[PDB]
Design a protein around this ligand. Structure first.
Ligand SMILES: CCCCCCCC/C=C\CCCCCCCC(=O)O[C@H](COC(=O)CCCCCCCCCCCCCCC)COP(=O)(O)OC[C@@H](O)CO
Ligand SMILES: [C][C][C][C]N([C][C][C][C])([C][C][C][C])[C]C1=[C][C]=C([C]([O])C2=[C][C]=[C][C]=[C]2)[C]=[C]1
Ligand SMILES: [K+]
Ligand SMILES: [K+]
Ligand SMILES: [K+]
Lengths: 317, 168, 317, 317, 317
């Protein structure tokens, strides 16, 4: 590790102390010839002309080739070991704006098609997950995501957000409770399997709990007879066939600052059904007649993608 | 084996299996038995949604496509998943409802302009469905007939005002 | 991958702007000197004169050894990552007349005894399949064949013909619906297991279904009493012991273009029993008296190999 | 394969042409300068004087570093592919007097203790078997030992003796039937698990059938009362604590040829109990008194290891 | 193996015997030129001039490139084979004060947090266990810990102490008996699981038996009503929150050699409740009023960390 530099300095001082005491040159040109001979350049401007120098340069050359051999052996061993440890995901993480994804499922594969490949880090433990991750282009980190000392290898303290989706609903609560000991303020997005465990993920510290199995369990039972509710959720939230549930932020100025929704009239002049506003970590669904807009508000509305372009220009100034 | 479970002449057939490869084959096995029974499938991946409609599923639900698209968008703000969780999943205060229009009760033949459906009730009107065709955001030039299912989002004290506004 | 060439250009311009601005030679001569120095050639016709130039040469030498070290480091990283992401699949197919075999059974191991070794690409997921694939000469593309995202990794849009034999029967229908989304004109040759799925493989889009378990079920129930049906199937279709079923076209000219089956008299001049003719993507089994032969018709017949060689001679002009 | 050699011959012919046609010296000194330059020796006695030749020298240096990088890339690719193929089996056996051991158990681990390391090629399929073989000093060949195509990987055609101990008797019969298809002369030593399959291995082609589950099946069912039969088998055949069942051949001459067993009198002069003689692939247990010895007859006898040194001197001359 | 050195001496003696006899130069200058040319330094002071000498220098350069190629090939092959055989743990152990840990559980993962990383060698067989070893910085030695042949692979004869913790108790008694066959004095710290196996580990030869499942059988069934005993075991032995159980040795002399516990009165002086005294591999819990301390006695007591540093200064010399 460090002894390679010691052996480099030993061969360098041996070459300089030999060339100065044999050939009779000054120490600057002796060090220059030592670096020329060790690095196998050989300008020949200060070659040894003495027989003792001619037999000492052989020893300096074989020591330089041994130095190069030991250095390249340590380099190739370190490269092969680090590439074997990076292969099965036994590496630490040193990024600072990444998205750790604890666990792997189809719901986490669909959140890779709306993010960047090298930006996200999948922290799982199974073997066939690691091959499934690299086909999607993400970075696999081997570890137990319920263990606190294996979330620190995913750099969960310096993560942008954490997406938790594990194999059971008893490990989603354990993974969230482990992250909230490491970092209190990092944003955790969770996937709840059972309906009864949604209040456990909010208590453990998930900033946003998604329950895809409670949504289907209500859409399956209300679409037995006629089912127009499961056509809206599929065409807007799932497929985005005609509409899209879009969220637009209100900047400063914006030609709509301070106005009420009566004088705003966002649906009738644009075509976007205003569902709710995002005033500070609470979604005021159907705001009243005298609600006043503010700076940094997130307007959540559904509409055609043509109707968002008539809204994104109506909201900017 | 589907004939042993009496899939011929049922109300609806909910299909959800271990993978999408078996969900398509289960629908194709039901359409060899009854071609009119309602199939409510469960798509796992996004690309297999249109393969369930060609197989014959009358309704395709995709949980891991909604939850996939709500995980990638909840990274920065997270206000779109706060609507789906608090209305579609848990029904904390608001909930999605669908109500029918009976024969000749307060709305037969009226337009949506002077229907005034949002003010007197408080329920946000998403769409109006007529015969397996959902017209999300119906325009002003649109009339209401009997049998039209009105799809709304509201509190349970407001839907009971809506069903009173629809009745005679 | 682009930092290495940046650092190489940086040390090159450092060598030129040090040799020109310390020693005082021209620009092209200093470029020649720094390319001689960094490559450890060392002609020594343009050696540095002043000791400050000697120390600059030492700095250029150690920076050149450093840039060779980091270049060999990145080349080793890329090469070990490529060789471990090619050994276990995880790679795309670049050929465009190849055959993709989705799944692996003994019915596709026999399909490699009549095809080339490196022409076929077996698309599967299991690790026990991969060592069985490489022992038989094929190339292994690791990927879920039921997924459309991993059928494009097998280059199925430009494949020559696709062979779907998956470990269940619900996945054979799903893999065809994944291919027909990609390329609607490629040839899919699927294996049906149950009898009720032969009609479901054709509606999915398979150009040719092969049901070996329906064949063996109709031969295990008809060979209990006497069993002369399964002696014909085993001697002609399985082993080709004495007889053999062939499919020969009608080439251009061919001396029989237009005559009837009575005038050709193929059964008496060759000894080959005529089963059916291939007039345009259908099989006319037992062609009648009034049938007329055309060009490109595939004659399907059984016979000895000493009789088929006189059938290919009779169809030439 | 040889495109590396095409590239290196192209760049040497490029260097020779661009030194001769520019500097105008002889062809042999141009070839000498090219081999001095591209190997980074750099004598400098024939340095480029023309600046066009200096740009040619920079270009030849870039091409030489490039072809050394492509050669290093090809060498690392070959070495990584061949070292990762070799570690998990996948190499045909090129030996001619080796012992193939199909399958692996404790009965084939107590077999390696009397055999060599590079002489034994274990032919198994499982992956945890591979680590157990290499710790034991033998070599591992990945293959299905019930398949004829994978028995030819282990060079079973020119093997010395083949030892079959598979998972069950159903595959041991199929392994002997696969070797006997390949050659009808190699010695097959097979382990029979059940008693009813001892007659089935000998009809398959096994030369020696060893049934240890039938030995201990009868040694347990006779040691309930007294247990003296299992006290001899454990002390002579298993541990060899006091005695040892040894077999010695009668060499040519050897002072005992032609004599009967009563005038030879082996037990009362040496101390070994003569169980039976090995007259030509048949063991005559308890030979009669008029049995005359022959040349090459193998005498099987139990006794102390001191009574074998007294036997191998009394049997020899 | 060492044939690289024979090839290098062959090309050196070929270079010297060629250069001295062609260019007419003496043996020492030819040896210096050969060691300059083979290692590609190229001073150019004794370069050839004859075309035969030039062609000989080309062949020497070719043979030097060849011996460099086979040397880097053997080095890369050895490094790849070593670092893959070191990865899965097929190497022997050379340390002689290390700790061998047979098996892997949370009871041995909480042991590596109070030991060093490179000092411990986990001897297990499971593949997913091996990746759990490398996260904790320990070394993985592949092998079955029950086998005596695979306990010598972990160098258990010259180990400091051995920790036996296997998947059942039946493997734990067999691992202790496998170590006591090898070394009859190495310290074995084994984990019993059932209560009936505590007396069996001590007859097997375990020096220390730690049974955590019997402690939690007496702490679960006695904390149902009140739960005050389990508060002491968790706060002193598990968490070490306020109090902590320590073992403080009595060195040579040390101001308390010969006085009784009446003359000591450790609880009033320091505050550490002396549980027992460790006089020579026994434990006299609650020593009497007339007991006297000796040199090398181990005082066992509980106390605060500020209360135990008062004891270690009261016991110092
Ligand atoms: C070709 C000859 C190269 C020899 C260097 C061998 C590595 C020396 C010790 C290797 C230890 C090490 O630091 O690993 C990597 C080396 O990569 C490196 O860029 C280290 C380059 C060292 C440059 C020194 C000049 C770190 O990253
Ligand atoms: C032959 C071919 C060529 C190669 N080489 C030479 C060798 C001889 C054998 C050069 C480079 C270019 C590529 C190599 C080398 C390099 C470098 C060096 C130097 O010192 C060093 C390294 C490391 C550490 C220290 C020092 C050393 C060495
Ligand atoms: K060099
Ligand atoms: K190298
Ligand atoms: K040189």
């Amino acid at each position: 590790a460090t002894r390679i530099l010691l052996l480099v300095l030993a061969v360098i001082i041996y070459g300089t102390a030999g060339f100065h005491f044999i050939e009779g040159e000054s120490w600057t040109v002796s060090l220059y010839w030592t670096f020329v001979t060790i690095a196998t350049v050989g300008y020949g401007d200060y070659s040894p002309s003495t027989p003792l120098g001619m037999y000492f340069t052989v020893t300096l050359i074989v020591l330089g080739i041994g130095t190069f051999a030991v250095a390249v052996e340590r380099l190739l061993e370190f490269l092969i070991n680090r590439e074997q440890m990076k292969l099965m995901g036994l590496i630490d993480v040193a990024k600072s704006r990444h998205v750790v994804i604890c666990g792997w499922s189809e719901s986490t594969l669909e959140c890779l098609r709306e993010l960047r490949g090298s930006e996200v880090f999948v922290l799982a433990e199974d073997e066939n997950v690691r091959k499934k991750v690299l086909r999607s282009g993400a970075n696999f980190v081997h570890g137990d995501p319920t263990r606190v000392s294996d979330l620190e290898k995913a750099n969960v303290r310096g993560a942008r957000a954490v997406i938790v989706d594990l194999e059971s609903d008893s490990e989603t609560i354990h993974c969230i409770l482990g992250i909230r000991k490491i970092d209190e303020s990092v944003r955790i997005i969770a996937e709840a399997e059972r309906y009864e465990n949604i209040e456990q993920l909010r208590m453990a510290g998930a900033d946003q709990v998604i329950s895809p199995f409670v949504i289907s369990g209500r859409l399956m039972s209300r679409s037995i007879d006629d089912g127009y509710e499961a056509m809206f959720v599929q065409d807007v939230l799932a497929e985005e066939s005609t509409r899209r549930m879009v969220e637009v932020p209100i900047p400063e100025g914006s030609k709509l600052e301070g106005v009420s929704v009566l004088d705003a009239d966002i649906h009738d002049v644009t075509g976007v059904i205003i569902i709710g506003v995002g005033r500070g970590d609470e979604l005021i669904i159907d705001p009243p007649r005298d609600y006043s807009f503010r700076a940094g508000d997130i307007i959540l509305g559904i509409g055609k993608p043509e109707e968002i372009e008539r809204l994104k220009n109506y909201i900017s100034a």
